Amino acid sequence: MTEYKLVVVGAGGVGKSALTIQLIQNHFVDEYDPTIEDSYRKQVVIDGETCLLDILDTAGLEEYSAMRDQYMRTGEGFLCVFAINNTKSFEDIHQYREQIKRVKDSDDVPMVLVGNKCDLAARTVESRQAQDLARSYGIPYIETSAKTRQGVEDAFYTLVREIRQH
Amino acid sequence: MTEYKLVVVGAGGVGKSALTIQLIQNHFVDEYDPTIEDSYRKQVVIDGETCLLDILDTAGLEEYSAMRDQYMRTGEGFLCVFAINNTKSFEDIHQYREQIKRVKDSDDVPMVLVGNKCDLAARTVESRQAQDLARSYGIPYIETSAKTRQGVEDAFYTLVREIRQH
Ligand SMILES: Nc1nc2c(ncn2[C@@H]2O[C@H](COP(=O)(O)OP(=O)(O)NP(=O)(O)O)[C@@H](O)[C@H]2O)c(=O)[nH]1
Ligand SMILES: Nc1nc2c(ncn2[C@@H]2O[C@H](COP(=O)(O)OP(=O)(O)NP(=O)(O)O)[C@@H](O)[C@H]2O)c(=O)[nH]1
Ligand SMILES: [Mg+2]
Ligand SMILES: [Mg+2]
């Protein structure tokens, strides 16, 4: 069956893993649990096609360097996550975008900018900032909350259709 | 506030109106009620931006001709709906696509192919057929059910982000 090799990328503490686990296990993880590397496979039906989603949940900070080079070359599409109440996480998005471009030899790699934690009133990144960024990269911008499940299948299905249309 | 002028297009009986009403009024219309022309405005928040959705729900069959020319030139983006248990409705999609192209003077107009009634086991249009069609047009393909609300905000938000990225 069709498999789509997805990787969730972004700064430490932005909700990469809580996003991933709301999709696969249907619940919010409210605690401190930093990732090294975690892999999830789930058979799912998207727009009538049977497929398997093979998600690689990555570390934010780490000694991950060209140890990131390795998962970035096998990933077919990328969720690039930041948190809307953390301005620094938003500036680091550029970092992840160029390093993805570098290793894939491509300027057009399947990608969606995800602004997570939208349930929180304490926003420091305006939607318009991120909308314009995502438009400069030729990329979709979707806001999510791993807390309320607002936008999580959206962000992930949108990325599977980007890989389709590539 | 930003307004997005959306129009729902497609053959008679495909679920144009039940799709529209599940979005705006949160319920399934199980009856016979053909449309002439209906308009819906709703203030909504998509990906943190405040916007108003101005949806034009159109007639499928009619004496609608260049009386369709008029709403097709003011529409910013189009949902092109067919039903997955009606092969003829799927072949007519081409009709609506060329006439949209003609009046907008454009080959790149915001559009998403929607395959509705996916809750029904009695499919005559395979997902792969429609996936390939939608890929030949450079367009997203999303399946919906106005009955279960499966995919309806998806199909509509996807089209608002196409207008954004245009
Ligand atoms: N309110 C709110 N909190 C969230 C959301 N997503 C994650 N969190 C909280 O943010 C914290 C960090 O989440 P986690 O998913 O572990 O983030 P990470 O990006 O995976 N961190 P790491 O890079 O170290 O692996 C946790 O306390 C989590 O409960 C969200 O959408 N909203
Ligand atoms: N099972 C199922 N039935 C649906 C769905 N969408 C619409 N229907 C049924 O299909 C019939 C026609 O629906 P309607 O929404 O009126 O279609 P239309 O495309 O708007 N028709 P018209 O072009 O004449 O205006 C109704 O009986 C409706 O209840 C769906 O997703 N699933
Ligand atoms: Mg993590
Ligand atoms: Mg109707």
- A13 C-alpha to ligand 1 centroid (Å): 5
C-alpha separations of B101 from A3, A27, A118, B137 in Å: 34, 45, 37, 11
C-alpha separations of A14 from A11, A18, A131, A158, B71 in Å: 6, 9, 18, 20, 43
Q: Which ligand is nearest to the CA of B62?
A: 2
**Residue A127, both tokens:** 């939607």
Count of residues making up chain A: 166
- A108 C-alpha to ligand 1 centroid (Å): 28
Separation CA B124–CA B50 (nearest Å): 39
- Cα torsion through B166, B135, A107, A4, rounded to 10: 120
**Which of A52, A24, A26, A48 lies closest to A38, judged by CA?**
A24
Structure determination method: X-ray
Cβ within 8 Å, pair A161-B140: yes
Give me the residue from A48, A131, A138 closest to B49, CB to CB. A131
Distance from CA of B49 to the nearest CA of A (A): 6
B17 lines ligand 2 (CB under 6 A): yes
Evaluate whether the domain defined by A1-166 bears CATH number 3.40.50.300. yes
Chain A residues closer than 8 Å to B118 by CB: 48
Yes or no: say if B160 and B46 are a contact pair by the CB < 8 Å rule: yes
- B145 C-alpha to ligand 2 centroid (Å): 10
Residue closest by Cα to atom 12 of ligand 2: B13
Cβ within 8 Å, pair A141-B158: no
Yes or no: say if B146 and B18 are a contact pair by the CB < 8 Å rule: yes
Cβ within 8 Å, pair B49-A128: yes
Considering only alpha carbons, which residue of chain A is nearest residue B138? A165
Query: A140: helix, coil or strand?
Result: coil
Place of tokens 């009024």: B25
Separation CA A161–CA A110 (nearest Å): 9
Resolution in A: 2.0
Domain ranges of chain B: 1-166
Separation CA A143–CA B1 (nearest Å): 19
**Residue B118, both tokens:** 């996916």
- Cα torsion through B44, B165, A147, A117, rounded to 10: -100
Separation CA A142–CA A22 (nearest Å): 16
A120 lines ligand 1 (CB under 6 A): yes
Cβ within 8 Å, pair B141-A115: no
**Which of A157, A152, A154, A161 lies closest to A20, judged by CA?**
A152
**Residue B115, both tokens:** 């395959």
B147 lines ligand 2 (CB under 6 A): yes
Separation CA A125–CA B63 (nearest Å): 50
Cβ within 8 Å, pair A118-B48: yes
- A90 C-alpha to ligand 1 centroid (Å): 15
**Which of B108, B4, B58, B157 lies closest to A161, judged by CA?**
B157
* Ligand 1 mutation pick, A147, A148, A150, A152, max ligand atoms within 8 A of CB: A147
